[PDB]
């Protein structure tokens, strides 16, 4: 095979799925008895075997490739709001860059794993890290997956074309970023800012 994006999409796919899954544990989108802690990217990260979720991310990952990789994927935002009665409280936003000028394609294997390990290391850690930094939390919140494209993005009932909603009042804190000639992944999470009045 003479693929190109598939390579980056491979890491980017497992990267998002790993970083995302970890988010749910770090956040509390479902019972902890459903996830498994593993050592991927050379470091320890947790994962989940949730079928429903796996089915949610399956469609996302499947189309992420078809709909996103076939239209350029640049950034990703995640809106997490307490379903019980807390509105938007946590919003996990990560940047995704697929293919960064490489018309050559004359280099055996074009994918950075080491630099990846570092990012993914901080990505899995930053999620879990901030949580510990938070004063306890675990609400049956709802999920909102956001995707950032470039050209005209055509969506039916699957997604909602927008994004600027930028929550109502939350602070965004940078955690880490990485840019390679084959792809670039950024990491920054935001949560509801206290002191409303």
């Amino acid at each position: 095979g003479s693929i190109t994006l598939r390579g980056s999409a491979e890491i980017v796919a497992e990267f998002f799925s790993f970083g995302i899954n970890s988010i749910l544990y770090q956040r509390g989108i479902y019972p902890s008895e459903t996830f498994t802690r593993v050592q991927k990217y050379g470091l320890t990260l947790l994962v989940t075997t949730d079928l429903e979720l796996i089915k949610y991310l399956n469609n996302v990952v499947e189309q992420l490739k078809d709909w996103l990789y076939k239209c350029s994927v640049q950034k990703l935002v995640v809106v997490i709001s307490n379903i019980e009665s807390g509105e938007v409280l946590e919003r996990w936003q990560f940047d995704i860059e697929c293919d960064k000028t490489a018309k050559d394609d004359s280099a055996p294997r074009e994918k950075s794993q080491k630099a990846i390990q570092d990012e993914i290391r901080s990505v899995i850690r930053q999620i879990t890290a901030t949580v510990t930094f938070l004063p306890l939390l675990e609400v049956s919140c709802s999920f909102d997956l956001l995707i950032y494209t470039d050209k005209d993005l055509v969506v039916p009932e699957k997604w909602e074309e927008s994004g600027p909603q930028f929550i109502t009042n939350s602070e965004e804190v940078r955690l880490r970023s990485f840019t390679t000639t084959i792809h670039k992944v950024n990491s920054m999470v935001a949560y509801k800012i206290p002191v409303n009045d």
């Binding site: 429903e52 996302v60 999920f143 997956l145 995707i147 997604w159 994004g163």
Partner: peptide, 10 residues
């Protein structure tokens, strides 16, 4: 142009 993905239901 970014997307918005809705959550589950029940």
């Amino acid at each position: 142009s970014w997307y918005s993905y809705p959550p589950p239901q029940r």
